[PDB]
Design a protein around this ligand. Sequence first.
Ligand SMILES: N[C@H](CP(=O)(O)O)C(=O)O
Ligand SMILES: N[C@H](CP(=O)(O)O)C(=O)O
Lengths: 222, 222
Amino acid sequence: HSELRKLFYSADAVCFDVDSTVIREEGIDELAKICGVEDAVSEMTRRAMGGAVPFKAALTERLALIQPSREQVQRLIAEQPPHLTPGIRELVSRLQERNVQVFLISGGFRSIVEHVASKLNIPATNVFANRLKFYFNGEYAGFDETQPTAESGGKGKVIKFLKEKFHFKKIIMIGDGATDMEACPPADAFIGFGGNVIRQQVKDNAKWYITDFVELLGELEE
Amino acid sequence: HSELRKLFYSADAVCFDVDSTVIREEGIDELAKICGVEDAVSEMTRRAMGGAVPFKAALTERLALIQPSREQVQRLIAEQPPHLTPGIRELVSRLQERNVQVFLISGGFRSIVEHVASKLNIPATNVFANRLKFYFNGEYAGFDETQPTAESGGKGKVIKFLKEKFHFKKIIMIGDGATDMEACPPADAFIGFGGNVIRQQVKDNAKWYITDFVELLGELEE
Ligand SMILES: N[C@H](CP(=O)(O)O)C(=O)O
Ligand SMILES: N[C@H](CP(=O)(O)O)C(=O)O
């Protein structure tokens, strides 16, 4: 491990996944759970197997029903269902402290992630997810469809944005699934993370895969 | 005119447009006023006339220009700019007691046009106005593009979709601009209006061009 190594503090940027990595809960499956469409949606996932369906349709569909009112995502935020995965709040601090711009990247919703941000004392400007839309009524209107993460494989389209513009050079992506990982070729280094989720197909092909956000404290100190 | 005008007592269902027919000022220009686009929006609508480009196109621009937030549109119905015309309330109130159907077909936003519908006591479902989308953070995000009132000749779409639906014998349209008039053929009959706004087009060209419900309420109160 010494290899890491402050491998990490040789970085100017460290982009984090929120769902399943920055936090134990997913961000979409929760919205549905608070909508009485809980097992209705969790039943929508088994067939993407095939994935036919691409990411935009996929989400435009599972979302095409939830029909998350503004209210409802408000009740969600109010209930604070999101629970951070245990050494993030402090890990993000030890980073931005040493003078590193922490970022958050999700296929989830800016409504939720933003709140997640404040609790990591992460800037608001440093967040990237789908922007949910509502009618005056507060009914589900869809969602921003130009946002980098509304299309398949747009997770990296952003990580190479953050560089195109602020010119970081040497940024890390902490993520749990192969979408987070596939972003490494566009981004400098990928640290897998299973928490909560082991997702074998990353724990097998990925270099540098931690079990928990604590494993990286002892080495971080020394 | 041949007076007393069986026009109205025979009637099954009458419907009027919202913007300076049943109300004093227009929602778009008034909304644009609290955004600083007043002069700019005002000048676009005026050029929008008898062969002007469709509705759907030009109201994408105007709104793209204004860019109204859930905070701006909600506080408007605070300043409640919408002013009912003199003889609108109890003209419709009159006809509503007799068991007829009254409707609001307007190329405005129900976000606003429904505050009007309320107390004229018209249902909420008897209002056809395109909706305005909004982000969770309350910012402009387009408008429902699937609504009849969102494109040109839209008014005659909801009307002809109103007879097949509820099945009426005497549907009467009442508007101020030729637009609201282009729908007469689908509807049984049309009555103009120049109380707030003038525009010859319709003044000298239709049957029973009433100016001001006051000036037709007299023979109506008959
Ligand atoms: N891309 C997701 C992460 P998220 O659902 O936060 O977008 C994964 O592959 O696990
Ligand atoms: N299209 C509007 C009518 P409304 O504002 O009711 O949509 C006009 O005649 O100028």
